[PDB]
Design a binder for this molecule. Sequence first.
Ligand SMILES: [Zn+2]
Ligand SMILES: [Zn+2]
Ligand SMILES: [Zn+2]
Lengths: 105, 71, 1168, 149
Amino acid sequence: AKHHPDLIFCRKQAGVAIGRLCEKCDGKCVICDSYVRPCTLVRICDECNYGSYQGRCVICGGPGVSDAYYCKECTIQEKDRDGCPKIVNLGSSKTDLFYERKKYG
Amino acid sequence: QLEHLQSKYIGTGHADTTKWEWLVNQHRDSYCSYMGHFDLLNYFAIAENESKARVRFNLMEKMLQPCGPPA
Amino acid sequence: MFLYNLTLQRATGISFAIHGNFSGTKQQEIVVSRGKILELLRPDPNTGKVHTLLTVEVFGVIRSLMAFRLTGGTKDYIVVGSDSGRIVILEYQPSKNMFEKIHQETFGKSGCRRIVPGQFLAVDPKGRAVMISAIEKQKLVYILNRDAAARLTISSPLEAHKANTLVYHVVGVDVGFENPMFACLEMDYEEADNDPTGEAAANTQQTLTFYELDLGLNHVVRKYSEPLEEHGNFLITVPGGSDGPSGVLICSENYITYKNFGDQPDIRCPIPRRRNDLDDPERGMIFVCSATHKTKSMFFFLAQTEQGDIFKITLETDEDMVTEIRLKYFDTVPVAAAMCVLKTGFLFVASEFGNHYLYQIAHLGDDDEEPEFSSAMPLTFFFQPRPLKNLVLVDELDSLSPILFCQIADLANEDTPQLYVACGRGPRSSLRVLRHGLEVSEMAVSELPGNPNAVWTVRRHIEDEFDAYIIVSFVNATLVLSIGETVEEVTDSGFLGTTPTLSCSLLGDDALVQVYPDGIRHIRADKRVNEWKTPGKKTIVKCAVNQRQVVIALTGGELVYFEMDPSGQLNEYTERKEMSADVVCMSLANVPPGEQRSRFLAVGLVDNTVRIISLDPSDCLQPLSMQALPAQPESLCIVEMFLYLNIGLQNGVLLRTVLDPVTGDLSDTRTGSRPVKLFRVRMQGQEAVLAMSSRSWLSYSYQSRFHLTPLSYETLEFASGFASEQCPEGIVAISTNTLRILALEKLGAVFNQVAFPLQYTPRKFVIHPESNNLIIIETDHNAYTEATKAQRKQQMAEEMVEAAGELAAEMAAAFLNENLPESIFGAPKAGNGQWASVIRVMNPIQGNTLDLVQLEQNEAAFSVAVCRFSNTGEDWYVLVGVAKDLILNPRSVAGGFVYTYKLVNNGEKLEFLHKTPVEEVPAAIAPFQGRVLIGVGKLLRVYDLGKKKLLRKCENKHIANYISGIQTIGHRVIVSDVQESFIWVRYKRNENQLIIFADDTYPRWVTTASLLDYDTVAGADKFGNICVVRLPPNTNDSQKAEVIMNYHVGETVLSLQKTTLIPGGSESLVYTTLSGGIGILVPFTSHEDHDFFQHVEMHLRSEHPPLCGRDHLSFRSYYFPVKNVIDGDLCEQFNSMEPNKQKNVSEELDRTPPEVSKKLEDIRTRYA
Amino acid sequence: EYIGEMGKDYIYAVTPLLEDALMDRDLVHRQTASAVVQHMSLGVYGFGCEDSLNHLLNYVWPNVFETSPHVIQAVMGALEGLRVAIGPCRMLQYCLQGLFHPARKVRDVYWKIYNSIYIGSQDALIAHYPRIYNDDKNTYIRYELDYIL
RNA sequence: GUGUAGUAUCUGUUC
RNA sequence: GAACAGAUACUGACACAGUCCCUUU
Ligand SMILES: [Zn+2]
Ligand SMILES: [Zn+2]
Ligand SMILES: [Zn+2]
């Protein structure tokens, strides 16, 4: 998340839906990308969870197999009291990798 | 480029912020803090022989144009 | 250097009150929200004594509290909006007696923020949606739909954020089953900042817009826009649909407006005014609160004004239109911020300050003789107030919430430090005295010389509500009486009482058992004499009476077991017990409701050993277990509330033991050098115990709570109980050569109070060393002096006479004939810069005034302190600071004066001596070494007594702000700034110069301060923060100070003092707050206890979150991080936790819950 | 970061290393030192260890005048982590001096820091606000806090 | 081994 | 210290084979 300056969160009022995480994003903090002390749960806005977006990873958009939590540092800093952490940007790195794979097979 | 956090809030300053707007925002926030607290308002109620309603009314119609007229 | 936080009293200030059926039944209950404490209480129509039910701390600031019910349900759900960024919905479980969290939604950051919602809470009357709005730019709407599981659900919040807008008040509007509608006092300010010509505040009115809630499309948009011509403050809901038309009221200055959507034009009505008000005619009038008694027959709206007058608004409306609004005069009450009318005529008024009363409606006031008012009458309204006729006072609540000054000293002949608290505002101001114990009621006193030993009550029937026999026995005299409301000496008793009586019980229905040292006596209504004489000259010691079993004890331990068969004749077992000591006390278990006999038994011995014996015939009178005690036991008894046992010894100890053959816990406290004897007493229809000592101790059990509190009376030997209709609860105690009757009307658990009324609001008071008198000064804003009031009344009478009303105006004499009392009708006063000053001397023993001192209109008294001068003799001088034309909101003053008295006749007389001019009003008086320090504004002057006026010798000008307090120690002096924390000042002797050598770095709004040691200052803060600043021990005599402690209580503290509360205790830091709560700070003794408490608190912080979802660590670290302080409330919350979590935490800590409870209660017992 | 609340005892040993690191030798060392300070301050939060943390701010503060995004982000994170542990008064005092500097870039960076501290924990700021004397036209004095009982 | 951003350090010519 | 053009290093617990999350007159 922090490693990519081109990604912008939705930053909208949270609803009742629960964010989901895939296999390779199991124990990673959504905001600060940590691996220690999951404390609270992640809430996402309604429009980010509709139709094909149901049950998807918040970072990479993969299939949802694990829940999304917040670390203790984010709770202490009160950075969890914000909009939904869903990433709306498609990501330049993923598209470039896909196109390179297409060109070399 | 990552500055949207400071753009969706009320009272946030910027490069060309002068003294008047900062002071009036400070006064507004101070009045809101006075209204929110209970014992901080009880202190004012004891200090001057009025009631809670009169103090609340004075604070409500003192938030419009504090620190004098603009310039 | 680590302290512990403890609480003694609970906040009594009332801010919100909501009525409803929170238990789901048909009995109304009241929910009251304190500053940071949520309390639930209900009334009782049969008695009228209101008893608290639930009290839980929320650890946060509550800004709103509403209740609602679903469309079809019978339970009321509480919605609380606190300073946090989340909304919580609460529920009440009568069985669990605890609030249960239901739903929790977050919508922003925590704390009191301008744009964060939580201030105004809007709830639809039917209970289909809830709206929460912020001060600026933020509004939220929730839909509380219910599911098929008979529960409730919450949906996602909606968006209604208007840009750059202010909100005054939000209230729901009844629509009658269509889309809900909300109304608010919308206001715009964008053009205010766009006008540099200074024409923004003028011609800028507020509007009233309605917000729609479409359940279909699920969005909120602005619908209406109705600008007003006045400036309203708050709205009033009106029932709609079937009963009455839907609409809102517009409370304003001297006007009330009814508004509705559709074809309803605006209607105005002037506010009635009292006859010949004593206030400024140009002053406006507003409303403070209202009420809604939505009776099925008709609905009427209550109201209250600034002066405290209750009106009765009746809506005379057509089916679709409205004709006129009719007003009425109802009664007069003290100023209140929130009131609610209840069913069956009950009315609850929560006064802003002072005591809270609960009135009962006896007369409905249907078309009273006094004329009413209506909007149909063209052109002001006048009405003459009358004393309370419609309402009668039945019960009152004691609440010394507005504490302004606290002092601890011993003035009486006793050896207990009395607590003096100055509270109250205006005419209701009083000086209350707090003392540990219970209230004592005196009904009658009978003087019977002699040496009484014991007294018992025997009733002819097992469930009689009145006594039948009183065994008034002495050492060598016997007397028996009977109560018939004309108590005399009974004649047909025939008990043959010659020797002193040792036993009077009830074994059957009307069976009396008497014990004398030469045998055993049995008394029955019929001619049945089961009397057996003791063989030989041996004397029986005592017997163990009970409901169905009597066990006698003889010398040498040869106890005899007697069991009463249903036939009646006694029986003796075929076994006997023998011990090698004497028997002084016996214990018998209470009979079970179904079982005829019990099993537990206790026997006390002179050898300091107590044993448990099984009552079964298989092993009757056999040694089962062994237990040892330090001292010789005196008596033993078993009490219920599920039963607890207390062990009495020859010394002042009362061990707490659970029902168990094995030994239990050892919990004893101070209870002098007198034996403790257990005796059953009556306490609110429950089972309790009684103990005797140098001071009598009463122990009760309210919701499984134990508190060994004493009684506020002299030494007593024996006591009993008395139950009747006029006196449901009472205690009968026999004193030296006299008999006394006692009763406990109020609960009076701790800190009994006594009311001594004053004139104005007290500011400060001191205590004379030898005179032992309180010099109390008062000062009020916008007040009238008695001479000024008399002159103005004379001028008004002259004007009325000159009015020439046909010459034949008799109203001028009628008005002056009677004056309205200030304490019942309030104090009508007005002005802008009018002050007052009163100086009084009061005797602590009896609250009677000694001398009266009055000043001019523009004279204000601020500081008073008795002082002495070295150059003079033993004359005590009193100096009072006086201001001249002081106005509060703008800073502009002309000057001041300093008074000087003589204290003639050692404190019972005063006389004016002289004055002196000062540029600024003095701050405080600090006498030391025969020298008095005068603080004039930002300067610091040194003044010594002269011949005709005070003379100035030394001055210092280095304080950068206004000085609001000076504290002096035997060597140096500390000056309390208004913005800076502290400024250390050293006064040189050889050259007579004042210098500064120490100051702090963090500015603090310090109000009060105190010194704990030679280099420790316990400063305070205006907001509520408490900090201790200690100078480094390696400083010369810049040198910046350091902070060693920080804490946040959430309430403003205006008093600090480090003394000892209980005799033989330890130096504790007791403090009081303006809210009304009293707390103490206790330092730790050992590191093991410190780390155990720290671990307990750390576990409980994450295991037991607060009810309102507020971060406890962040709340305590509100302004500054907490340093070396442990919160005691979280630790004390251990008792009310669930058993499973208690077991889990006990296993985690490798301790037992009884051990944890004992460890927690050790600190409370030691330091209280 | 991993130790958490048990790192309060091991602050004395790392002070000389932090003292060496904060010197303007290379950007990587400064960034790593700022990260260390942020993590330690977040870990020791709530234990009243302000005495040791106050000294580090005097050397952390001069690391704000740089054009490298990585070091700027590290310094901002360190300041945000220290804010919850030391109190906003120190940073408010530091920012008040350079808030109205005649230059431009210093004003921008000071305003950014002030916005960062103003967004979070805004409630605990009214008490720490200073007193500014007013002119003859406008009023800049809050007389309500000068009330005396 | 490959790619995606940023930063720093040494050079051809010119102010 | 403003630039048109080259070479060498460092930082971000950064990423690396995805086959499918697909879609009308
Ligand atoms: Zn979203
Ligand atoms: Zn993923
Ligand atoms: Zn995190």
